Amino acid sequence: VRDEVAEKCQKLFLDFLEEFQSSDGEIKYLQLAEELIRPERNTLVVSFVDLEQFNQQLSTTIQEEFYRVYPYLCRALKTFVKDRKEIPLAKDFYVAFQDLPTRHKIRELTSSRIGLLTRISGQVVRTHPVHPELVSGTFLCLDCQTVIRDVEQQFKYTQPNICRNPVCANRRRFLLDTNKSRFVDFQKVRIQETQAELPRGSIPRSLEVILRAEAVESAQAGDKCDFTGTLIVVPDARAETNLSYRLVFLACCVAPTNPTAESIKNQMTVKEWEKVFEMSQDKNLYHNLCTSLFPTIHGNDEVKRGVLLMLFGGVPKTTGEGTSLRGDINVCIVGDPSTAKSQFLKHVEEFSPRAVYTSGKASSAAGLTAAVVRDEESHEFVIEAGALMLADNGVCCIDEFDKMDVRDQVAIHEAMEQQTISITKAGVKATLNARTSILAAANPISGHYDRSKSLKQNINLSAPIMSRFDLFFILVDECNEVTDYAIARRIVDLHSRIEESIDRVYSLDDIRRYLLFARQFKPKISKESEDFIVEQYKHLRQRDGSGVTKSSWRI
Amino acid sequence: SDQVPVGNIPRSITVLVEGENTRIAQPGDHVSVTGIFLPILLLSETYLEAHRIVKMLAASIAPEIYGHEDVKKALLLLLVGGVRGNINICLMGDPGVAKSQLLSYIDRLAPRSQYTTGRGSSGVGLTAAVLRDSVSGELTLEGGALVLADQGVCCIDEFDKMAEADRTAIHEVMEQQTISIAKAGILTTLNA
Amino acid sequence: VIWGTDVNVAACKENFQRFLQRFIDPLAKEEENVGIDITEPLYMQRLGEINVIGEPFLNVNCEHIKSFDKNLYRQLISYPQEVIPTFDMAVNEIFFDRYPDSILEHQIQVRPFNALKTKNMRNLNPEDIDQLITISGMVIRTSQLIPEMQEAFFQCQVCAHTTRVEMDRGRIAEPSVCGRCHTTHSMALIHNRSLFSDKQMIKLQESPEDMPAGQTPHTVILFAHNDLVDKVQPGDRVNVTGIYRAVPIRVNPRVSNVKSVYKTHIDVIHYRKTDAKRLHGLDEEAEQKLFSEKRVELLKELSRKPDIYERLASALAPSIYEHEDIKKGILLQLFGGTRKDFSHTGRGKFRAEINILLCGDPGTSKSQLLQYVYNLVPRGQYTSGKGSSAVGLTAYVMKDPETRQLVLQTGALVLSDNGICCIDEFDKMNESTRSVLHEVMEQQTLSIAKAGIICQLNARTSVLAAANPIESQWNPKKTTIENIQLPHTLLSRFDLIFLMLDPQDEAYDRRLAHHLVALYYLDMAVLKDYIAYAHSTIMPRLSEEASQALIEAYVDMRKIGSSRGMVSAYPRQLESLIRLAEAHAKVRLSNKVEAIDVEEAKRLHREALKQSATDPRTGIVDI
DNA sequence: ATGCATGCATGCGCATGCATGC
DNA sequence: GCATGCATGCGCATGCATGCAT
Ligand SMILES: Nc1ncnc2c1ncn2[C@@H]1O[C@H](COP(=O)(O)OP(=O)(O)O)[C@@H](O)[C@H]1O
Ligand SMILES: Nc1ncnc2c1ncn2[C@@H]1O[C@H](COP(=O)(O)OP(=O)(O)O)[C@@H](O)[C@H]1O
Ligand SMILES: [Mg+2]
Ligand SMILES: [Mg+2]
Ligand SMILES: [Zn+2]
Ligand SMILES: [Zn+2]
């Protein structure tokens, strides 16, 4: 029996690999496969738009018959690389595709798309440890001593149905030779439906993805990534001699949904580097960014500058005695109701790529820190990350900070101080790093700020957590007619012109790129800066004299 | 409670219903059942198979109590009811004027009636709760005193001593005649 | 047909073929027969519309079949499994006879509906097993898609031949011998080369509203197949037409012994959304078949009259005396504001809905208004005082009924998405419960972060709250803020606050008594159509004059509220005004917001709080 | 004859109700 | 007037022991 379609696909794909001429006249894939000599490389990346310009028939056949054709494409690639270079026969090879011009929602993955080539988007929730997995094992018969090789395991431990010797007909006595077997890398990941695809009154759906070989490396927890692959049924009506199933997604490539100073410089293109250089040589960068991130908000430039300084962050250091010095900055805001207090947190949500936001009692103790659960296919254990861990090296926003329970506040204080989360549960002891920066919003006890009382008497916050915050901002609503007029003008202008009332200088992508580039720098402290800081601190301490009215916060 | 011996607790029995005898018995009813006593498989467990199930001026309410001539027509009108046409009555009094006996008489006279003394039937005693099933093995909702007293008369003694939640539930029953429950695992509207 | 049945295939086929061409109803009106000539046969026109559009599904009413004849209706109800394929093949034959060269994806299927409605599920008997049943209920749980095999693919180990087997009677008999090499037990099943179909499990909560004494609500399980998957959402009130099934239960998975008591089960074949009492849903608003041109012209002519606004306020609730301002506010909430998009700005979601609070003595009809709103508006929810917990709303953790999927389960607020949530006895609610409302009333989103769960949910809900004074009486000596005892942050999020007081007027008492005694002894469909057309067609926009008017109104409100004792004003209140103005723009069917809408919104805001009668410098109201 | 489902503790995570202490 | 300490039900998973259906 012959598989005609598979043979034609093999021929066409080999011809495409051998013949595809690039824009410069050479062949990209020959040079790319020249790097497959290294034992650490097994997958070759092939673009789909280039295939669209070579053979539409082959493209349609591959798209509509991906699962049936893929092993034959792997065999063709193996033959090509074996012909082009001296490689040991034990090595295997795989193909990947990236540029699919269409996307499908998670809820749109019906049973009619089983075995077809699709591209989806999602958010990583959990990852499992790397494992080996069988591909085609070899079985030895215990009766007639006949060796049976190349039996497909699919997705279950399947022994040979019957001995290939007609006289033997053995079906229940076999031995597995692990030495001569065939292995491949295997990892399991969980993904979640994004908020933008949620219908009315619905909870986001969860899906399982499996990564093989090099694709195992990527897809870390907390990311927002696009996956390319197929939909394949895995067992979990009855059969008889003359059935429970579930859906599992196999992915080929994982990409960012919206995409070491020398490495960053090399990665960036010429135009991106030109834009970065243009930004770097502007003093108005200190002012323009304030207008860039908060266009609609009127006034409150101090809060904007504090938020920018918190976003940029400092340089952490370690001492010779074994102690550690904080390098992150935490900011707290307190103000009268409706004084634009919650808008900054939402702006940080929208701007920052790694940000987690919580409010009041909606987050439990297990919601923060982390959790430990079992591995489904081994004796190991896996850790589910909390809000703080997902915001590692990022910004964590907490609204209604006063409503949080005392235990939760103690946990937050521990995370701020030690910058480490220790878990000793279910026979598992572990320590994890949480280098986060906290932006918090709070309200007065009486609902309005008392001008005649100190800061400590106005907020129901414990002294330890109070002392850890670097900057405190206080907002008071002034009963001034001009301020009300100015606020009304901006609100009505925003409502009148939905999108035409914004004149940003730099796009958010450029700001993100510049922040990523700038956070790598580790500036030093000059000698004269030491004396300047000493004198300025002396003046600041002298400000605390008794010859002036009492201040709301001591130094 | 009359047949319970001294210092003991009432015992329970299980009855199976099949055929046209189904849909006759309801919770809270006093019934008489004629049946067969059979075991289930050398110890064994027993059960009952039902064959027959049966249910067990005019202002002369509680003649045992002297006086209160004008306090008895109101009870009769409460029992008769209006044409929502429901009626609610509260009696406030100094101790020793025997308010409890009138409530007990009203409870005994009414066909569907429930009587509450205080915190002994608070919270879960009213409203409803979710419990496992004997047959299906799943969760079902069982109502409280208010649910059982649907289309009947309920009597409450020592009303001022009840908890805030119970008082709010009673107010909701009085004004809206339906109870709304929305907690973890429960989302229901009960008719009372 | 199988033994035990009196159904004849040929007779039923001929009867259905004749019925599809002969049925004409004179009582049918243009109010529901949209785009169909009543003088001509109805189902033939439906088939023609199917041919024009290409939809492979046809809807047939059971009442029409019963009107044509009773034998066919009885046979269809008794034995749907044999009757339905006959109808399908007859329809396919007629369609292919009348319309050659048509292009579709598969043969036309027929879906019956509006069978005799069973009053209560618990009244059913084993005699009704495998019969057509119609139910009315609300969806609370929908599971994920499940694949079910239909064909099986087998491959040989030695010769590798391709064979296919079709499922029969729910069981697949795998061949024990090959077809080319004749080797025994040489065939292996391949799952990925097979064919699968979608299956979904849904949960319904039953509420016929005529329950007997002491009967608790019921929960039913439904199974949907093929395209019917994901046609409903949690919180929707739907009518389900389907079949009744009984399935045995195994004693344990690995032992073939089964329990004698069977398990109830229902298969779904048809869904209906329209209700004779409630307003149109969002599903209907995304279609063009709702309104005939005559009704559109009538509504457009009606909208031109100046008093129609007040007329609508007169037609909202005729069973409650006066309260014109409250009815106008309820109508404006029903119309809603413009749903602008601020994704590019980075500000986030903007609330386009109106929240209303009503404060007054217990002897008031606010509860009647809340009940009427709950019964009238679809996707409506009701809560009362301490009966609801903080975890009861939003979502709570519950395991999947079979495995450990950690399935978050929606609450009352989430089920109220794109709907109305009514709260009674708002005073008794604890601070923990109000913490949820603090985020819900503004951000329209809920953030959940518990063990293994981190997610955000949509909570686009408009809230009607009812409250009472401290002592259940409005003490004239105490101020409004003292009487209310609610935090300023919570009160600031309410667009309209209505203070209900008793003026003790003799004429008012006489009118109330006369109306109450007489209780012993506009068309709703027109109102529904007008509301749906206004809500699904027009997106209002505001001009410079409205801008200046709003600025002046905001500064005047701030000056008025600067005095102590009264409810102070905040910039957020300004936004509320805009929303109200937009609502007025929907009343007059105008795409442009004018100064009249701003003036009306200002008047309503002023009259709602009774600021005119209230003493500006003492906070005491005295009419 | 052998491997597996089930009965019986026990930890885990959670929500809910009753009491009290500032 | 409310958050918290102290039981207690609920739902679940996990580990240790054993008893026999295919
Ligand atoms: N200084 C300001 N500039 C512009 N808009 C403001 C300002 N202050 C308040 N607002 C408007 O008022 C609203 C305040 O709501 P919010 O920020 O949620 O208040 P809070 O955070 O104090 O609860 C926002 O929608 C914002 O548009
Ligand atoms: N008007 C009355 N006529 C006859 N007996 C009475 C009267 N008032 C009180 N009693 C007697 O006094 C006792 C009062 O006890 P109880 O009913 O518990 O009082 P309360 O209901 O007020 O707590 C009863 O046992 C009753 O026999
Ligand atoms: Mg806020
Ligand atoms: Mg008494
Ligand atoms: Zn052999
Ligand atoms: Zn063969």
Residue numbers in the entry:
A (entry chain 6): 18 to 253, 262 to 267, 292 to 308, 321 to 616
B (entry chain 7): 241 to 281, 292 to 306, 336 to 362, 372 to 480
C (entry chain 4): 151 to 671, 682 to 783
Paper text:
Eukaryotic DNA replication begins with the loading of the MCM replicative DNA helicase as a head-to-head double hexamer at origins of DNA replication. Our current understanding of how the double hexamer is assembled by the origin recognition complex (ORC), CDC6 and CDT1 comes mostly from budding yeast. Although both yeast and humans use the ORC, CDC6 and CDT1 to load an MCM double hexamer around double stranded DNA, our work shows that there are clear differences in how the two organisms accomplish this feat.
Two fully loaded hSH species were identified in both the recruitment (ATPγS) and loading (ATP) datasets. The path of the double helix is less distorted compared with the hDH structure, which positions L209 too far to contact the double helix and R195 retracted and engaged to a DNA-backbone phosphate. As a result, no DNA untwisting or melting can be observed in the hSH structure. In comparing the DNA grip of various MCM structures, yDH emerges as an outlier: ySH, hSH and hMO* all grip the DNA in a very similar manner to hDH.
